[PDB]
């Protein structure tokens, strides 16, 4: 733990400079809030990944803010008491359905862009409920656009059919309706009494405004070869694999 303590004091000395005053990151272990600029987020995520690779206990939260990446928090009750299979072919269709509502939102920028979907599930169940996040960290959109996509996915009959076929006993009440507001847990961190979400697989989706009908979805190879906490952050913009796709958003109106 010696090398973990060295990083913990390093984080404390590098983030104390950004202590909130009369907010994007919360350290629930220490109860201190910080206002980090985007230029300094990559160094922060670089230090967390070091602590993650050593199994350090951390509990950092990331406020989704008004304009950031999209997260979908599912809390599913399964037909059996075992964790969901979540085969790659099933999650690929989920990506397609999620993207159909993204394209229909009319916020995507012009040109060719790479979208990355990430699926992390909770290791153990809480109150008989299993959960998994669908992180689209590089695709930055407004909070209202997230509520539109979330509301559409709640009524998406195709998504409900897939979940029910996988054994989900609550396909209509599993998607958190407040997914656009809850802070995103950084990858390696979790509550003291709960295990951290583990990344199963990610998918790469290439989209071109020229040909909108061609939507190839391929699985990501060597995801663990990247700074996972940085690639999965909804507010990171300096990732290597995940490159930001800035969607249309009225910044000020979205805050008001």
Residue numbers in the entry: 21 to 42, 47 to 280
The article reads:
Here, we report the structural and biochemical studies of the highly conserved C962R protein of ASFV, showing that C962R is a multidomain protein. The N-terminal AEP domain is responsible for the DNA polymerization activity, whereas the DNA unwinding activity is catalyzed by the central SF3 helicase domain. The middle PriCT2 and D5_N domains and the C-terminal Tail domain all contribute to the DNA unwinding activity of C962R. C962R preferentially works on forked DNA, and likely functions in Base-excision repair (BER) or other repair pathway in ASFV.
To reveal the underlying basis for dNTP binding and incorporation by the AEP domain, we performed crystallization studies. One apo-form structure was solved and refined up to 2.6-Å resolution, showing that the AEP domain is composed of two subdomains: ModN (aa 1–90) and ModC (aa 91–285). In the AEP domain structure, the Met1-Tyr20 region is disordered. However, the region Asp10-Tyr20 is well ordered in the full-length C962R structure, folding into one α-helix (α1) and forming extensive hydrophobic interactions with the D5_N domains. The Ala273-Ala285 region forms one helix in the AEP domain structure, but is disordered in the full-length C962R structure. The Leu21-Val37 region folds into one helix (α2) in the apo-form AEP structure, but it is disordered in the binary and ternary structures of the AEP domain. The apo-AEP structure was solved by molecular replacement (MR) method using the model predicted by AlphaFold2 and the Phaser program of the CCP4 suite.
